[PDB]
Each structure stands twice: as C-alpha cells, then as structure tokens.
Amino acid sequence: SPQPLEQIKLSESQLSGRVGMIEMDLASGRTLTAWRADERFPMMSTFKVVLCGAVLARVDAGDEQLERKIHYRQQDLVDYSPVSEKHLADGMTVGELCAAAITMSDNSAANLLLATVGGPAGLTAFLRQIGDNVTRLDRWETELNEALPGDARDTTTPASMAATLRKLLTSQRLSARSQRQLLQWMVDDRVAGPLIRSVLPAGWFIADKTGAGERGARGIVALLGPNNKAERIVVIYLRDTPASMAERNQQIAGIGAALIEHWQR
Ligand SMILES: OC[C@H]1O[C@H](O[C@H]2[C@H](O)[C@@H](O)[C@H](OCCCCCCC3CCCCC3)O[C@@H]2CO)[C@H](O)[C@@H](O)[C@@H]1O
Ligand SMILES: *[B]([O])([O])[C][N]C(=O)[C]([C][C]C1=[C][C]=C([O])[C]=[C]1)[N]C(=O)N1[C][C]N([C][C])C(=O)C1=O
C-alpha cells in the first residue's frame, strides 16, 4: 500500500469525496498523520461515544446510575433500533442503552440517552465543559444524519473528535471505572468490530464506533495498535461522495492498510 497521506489523497480522487483523518497517540495526544483535520464532517453515529461519555459523567457525579431501568414506549422509537425494539415490555437499563447505542448503533437507545443529558444542546454543553469548542450536536436520530452539503449542524472535526475521545478515555475527567466502561463498549462493537478483526493482521488491537449518513457520509472513530495495545486514536470521516457503501468501506479499509504497513513514525 501507499504511504498514509498518499492513500488518503487517492481515496478522495476515487470517491470524488472529501476525507478527514487524524491519527493521534492515545497516551500523549501527539498528532501524527493529519488530513483536513480542522475541517467539519457530520459525526453520524460516532457521536454515540461522546453521548455515553456524558452519561458516565452523570453516573460519576451520582446523578445517574447505569443500573437504572428506563421503561420506554413504542412511540419513542426511531428507525434502526434492533435492541430497544426487543424491550417494550421490560425496558432497558441506562448501561444497556449505552451498550446498544455504541455496539449496535441503536438509534432509539441513543435518543433516550440524549434526553437524559439535556438533548443536543445538553450534549453540546458537555462538549464545551471538557474544552471541545468545535463539535456540535443539533438534532436527534435519525435527522442528524442528513449531511446536507455545507450544513454545520451535527458536525465535528477529526482533530476535535480525537482530542475529545482522548479526554473521555484517559484524562481522568471520568472515573477509572467509567473510563474502563467506555473503552469496553467500543471494544464490544458488533457493527464493524468483528469484520475489522477478520481483516486485521494478527496482533492488531481494535475498538471502534462507526457512523453512516446521507450523501456518502461515513465514518469511524477507533483505537488501533500493534502488540495488542490501544496505541492510537484514528478518526476517519468521508462526506459528499456519490460512492457505494461498499467502496466507502473499502476506502476506509485502504487508509487503514496504509497506516498498518507504515506505522512507525
Ligand atoms: O505486512 C503487513 C501486513 O500486510 C497484510 O495485512 C493486510 C491485511 O491482509 C488486510 O486485510 C488489511 O486491510 C486493511 C483492513 C483495515 C481495517 C479497517 C481499519 C480501521 C481501523 C482504525 C483506523 C480506521 C480504519 O491491510 C493489511 C496491510 O496491508 C498481511 O495480510 C499481513 O500478514 C501483514 O502483517
Ligand atoms: B448513525 O450513523 O447516526 C445511525 N445512522 C442512521 O440511522 C442512518 C442510516 C445508516 C444506514 C446506512 C445504510 C444501511 O444499509 C443501513 C443504515 N440514517 C440516516 O442516514 N437517515 C437520514 C435522515 N432520515 C431522517 C428523516 C432518515 O430516515 C435516516 O434514517
């Protein structure tokens, strides 16, 4: 494979789409590879990790419990809710809702959790509290995926999302147990995790959350590294491409291949 930046450029040309990428050391925060890292991209379902960071912050403060069971209704549901649809009779705990939101991208679980943190405005305020002055959530699932050209709603930048993920996972803003819970949810992703493992060389750690929207919008936030370690945060977003889902997946995978083959920096 080409050098990472050369592959990123190639992916843009082939997608006739815009790619945003950062690769960041998890321990120190050093930025290593960056491409359009200050440009805005729809977060799509990648926001669900930040959401559950805010939920965990409430748990740490004693204003929420992961055990607390929410008995929601059918009128609360939006599309792509495979876990929450199974529990109208019996409900789900707040912890189960975060697991469903992160590991199965469950949209109704995400909306239920979003209300508990003050809606899109509440989650945006949490972002400002942790020093992210860029990322913004404006809408609920599933409208937040609309990815209209030029629309700043529901966007982040690769650089902001990577810094925010590092803050949530490692900065001790969250308790030790909460940091470990957030990481474990990403480790347990079922949407893309197992597929990604199936194509990674032996020894490469993966934890992730993916996202998909309109107009070609597609993304992933991940922890990746050799020697079975979460060495780096890698954030890749695509937007404004007419390409097939299959190609968008392959192009992200190709950028990943370039990183794997050319990891020392
Ligand atoms: O020499 C390096 C490696 O070259 C190949 O590995 C290939 C692998 O066979 C292929 O499946 C993967 O595709 C890329 C899969 C990436 C998965 C998505 C990545 C995510 C992860 C977080 C960042 C965003 C994207 O590329 C690597 C590197 O060429 C060999 O198979 C392997 O034995 C060898 O160790
Ligand atoms: B996350 O990325 O925010 C969850 N994403 C969504 O719910 C996406 C669908 C993603 C998807 C792509 C391809 C598939 O085969 C299956 C699922 N939802 C949307 O993009 N939208 C956009 C806007 N409208 C809201 C009126 C939708 O109906 C919708 O679901």
Enumerate long-range contacts of 145-148, CB under 8 Å, 24 or more apart.
145/42, 145/44, 145/45, 145/211, 145/212, 145/213, 145/214, 145/217, 146/42, 146/213, 146/214, 147/42, 147/44, 147/213, 147/214, 147/215, 147/216, 147/217, 147/239, 147/240, 148/214, 148/215
Q: Please tell me if the CB atom of residue 145 comes closer than 6 angstroms to any atom of ligand 2.
A: yes
Q: What angle do CA 28, 30, 32 make, to 5 degrees?
A: 140
Give, using CA atoms, the residue closest to atom 14 of ligand 1: 257
- Asked if 208 and 186 touch (Cβ cutoff 8 Å), the reply is yes
Is residue 234 in contact with ligand 1, taking CB distance under 6 Å?
yes
Nearest atom in ligand 1 to the alpha carbon of residue 222 is 22
Which ligand number lies closest to the CA of residue 19? 1
Rounded to the nearest whole angstrom, what is the distance from the C-alpha of residue 62 to the centroid of ligand 2? Answer: 33
- CA count, 13 A, side-chain hemisphere, 156: 36
The H or E element spanning position 114 is helix 107-116
Rg (CA), the chain: 17
Closest of 237, 252, 259, 193 to residue 45, by C-alpha: 237
Q: List C-alpha distances in Å: 131 to 88, 216, 223, 250.
A: 37, 30, 21, 34
Please indicate whether residue 193, judged by its CB atom, sits closer than 6 Å to ligand 1.
no
Gap between the Cα atoms of 64 and 115, Å rounded: 13
Residue nearest to atom 17 of ligand 2 (CA): 212
For residues 206 and 226, give the distance between their C-alpha atoms in angstroms, rounded to a whole number. 9
Confirm if 182 and 208 have CB atoms less than 8 A apart: no
3-class DSSP state of 11: helix
| Residue 46 per-residue DSSP state | G
In the 8-state DSSP scheme, what is residue 123? Answer: H
How would you classify the pairing of strands 232-239 and 218-225? antiparallel
The one-letter amino acid code at 210 reads: T
Distance CA 159, CA 213 (A): 20
214 annotated ligand binder = no
Is the torsion defined by CA of 78, 53, 230, 17 positive or negative? positive
Ordered by where they begin, the domains of the chain are 1-265 (3.40.710.10)
- The answer to whether the annotation marks 198 as part of a ligand binding site is no
Ligand closest to CA 198? 1
Sign for the pseudo-dihedral over CA of 253, 255, 257, 260: negative
Q: Is 231 one of the annotated binding-site residues?
A: no
Give the method used: X-ray
Eight-state DSSP code of residue 35: E
Residues 9, 50, 153, 31, CA torsion sign: negative
List phi, psi (to 5°) of 8.
Answer: -55, -45
> Does residue 247 carry a catalytic annotation?
no
The closest of 264, 212, 262, 208 to 241, measured between CA atoms, is 212
The Cα-based distances of 129 to 34, 55, 152, 179 in angstroms read 25, 14, 20, 17
